[PDB]
């Protein structure tokens, strides 16, 4: 006898199609913020873009990378680790490294040391 579902905050999250009785789920349309990553116009005019909390496929359509923060566009993901220059988030940092381009990597917390004990 139940037609629609409401959650803990009283927002409808499910409906039963009236003609074929199949339970369906309502998930909000993607929304978020857009951020621009720049190394400063004093050095270059090449920027990267970050779409926060959005899957790369849903972005309307250089190099596309998915991170926990969101979809990064225009930055090449290296496999190394350096000190954080520009903090993107979730352990991901961006920098301007040599031709010459904007790279995205994972943070390095510092040099590895071992005291001779």
């Amino acid at each position: 006898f139940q037609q629609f579902g409401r959650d803990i905050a009283d927002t409808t999250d499910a409906v039963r199609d009236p003609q074929t009785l199949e339970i369906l789920d309502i998930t909000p349309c993607s929304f978020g913020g857009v951020s621009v990553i720049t190394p400063g116009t004093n050095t270059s005019n090449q920027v990267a873009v970050l779409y926060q909390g959005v899957n790369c496929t849903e972005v309307p359509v250089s190099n596309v990378f998915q991170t926990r923060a969101g979809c990064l566009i225009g930055a090449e993901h290296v496999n190394n680790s350096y000190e954080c220059d520009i903090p993107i988030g979730a352990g991901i940092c961006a920098s301007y490294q040599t031709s010459q381009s904007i790279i995205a990597y994972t943070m390095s917390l510092g040099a590895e040391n071992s005291v001779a004990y």
């Binding site: 927002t11 988030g89 040391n113």
Partner: protein
Amino acid sequence: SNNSIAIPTNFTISVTTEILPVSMTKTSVDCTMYICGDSTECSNLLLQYGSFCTQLNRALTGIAVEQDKNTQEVFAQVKQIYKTPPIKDFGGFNFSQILPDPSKPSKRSFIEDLLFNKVFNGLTVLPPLLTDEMIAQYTSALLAGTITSGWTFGAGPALQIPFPMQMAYRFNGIGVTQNVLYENQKLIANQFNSAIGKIQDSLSSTPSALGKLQNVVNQNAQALNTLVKQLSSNFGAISSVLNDILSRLDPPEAEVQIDRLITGRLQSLQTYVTQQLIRAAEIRASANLAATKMSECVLGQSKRVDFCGKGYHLMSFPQSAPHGVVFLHVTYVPAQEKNFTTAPAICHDGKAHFPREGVFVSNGTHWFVTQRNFYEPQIITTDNTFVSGNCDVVIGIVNNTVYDPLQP
């Protein structure tokens, strides 16, 4: 009484815990989307209120950046990443409960695992810049530096030293002689291990130990829930949903009802942002305190009373926790005191003798000079006493005899 003094004869190594929150969740509520998401007439009326939808976003962005700075300033206090040696013979002390456990995929310690286990209408939640793995890496580096180096790794180049000698230095810093450690090494190691085990058991048993972190999480969740619930209210208009406002009414009445809804929702958003600012200020104060304790208790040995624990501070160990830090303070407490009869000075040959470092005590028949925090009596000698004046000015001087080593 004016001649009785109590001196301890035994000690106890105790470990206490302290929990401090350092950061909170980074939420962000979009202004226009919350007040009215799909409507365009509502947006056009909302533009008439100027920049009430930029100040709120600016405030929330400032709060999020503040949270990241809080975590950064608390945990990132080590320049390098130190590692403990594979051989782990620290003279009897057993740091297994706090050192990282490589078997687990998360590489967290026993106590850290226990701690972590125990604990849209236009709104988004950002992820923290430092993942929990990096927080654990900081805490592990701090622990390895403390165990291997001492306090030297926080004031320059890290210098190795055997842990027994480091404990001897740390006793020497509270007024107890080095020889106390070396003659009771096994007993102290056993007490430390038992205390660490008891800390683990006490944390695991009682669930209401981590009150502050849960309190912060609950407060934030309740605030967000109240905002979402407040989204559906009339505020004097005919209906809360604005589709019925815009479909069943002519432009004038629809406009006035939309204005009423807009005013109510804007007031609610302002209230939420103000309370968030106050809460963020409180959390920043707590994070400043946590950073100070990390600097002074972990990287050094503080003489401030009741700052790093309850007793005479020996050292401290940091552990991570969801949105917070946990300090394990290892302290020294005396026990098994005994009464003694004491005198200010001693008149040997018409000259008053005072102790260099210690105090005069008595079985009841003989006189000895001892420490102040431990009972280690020894014969009175010219080596450990100094002369000043005659035997007439001191009130309470006691006639007795001293010994001179230059009499073989």
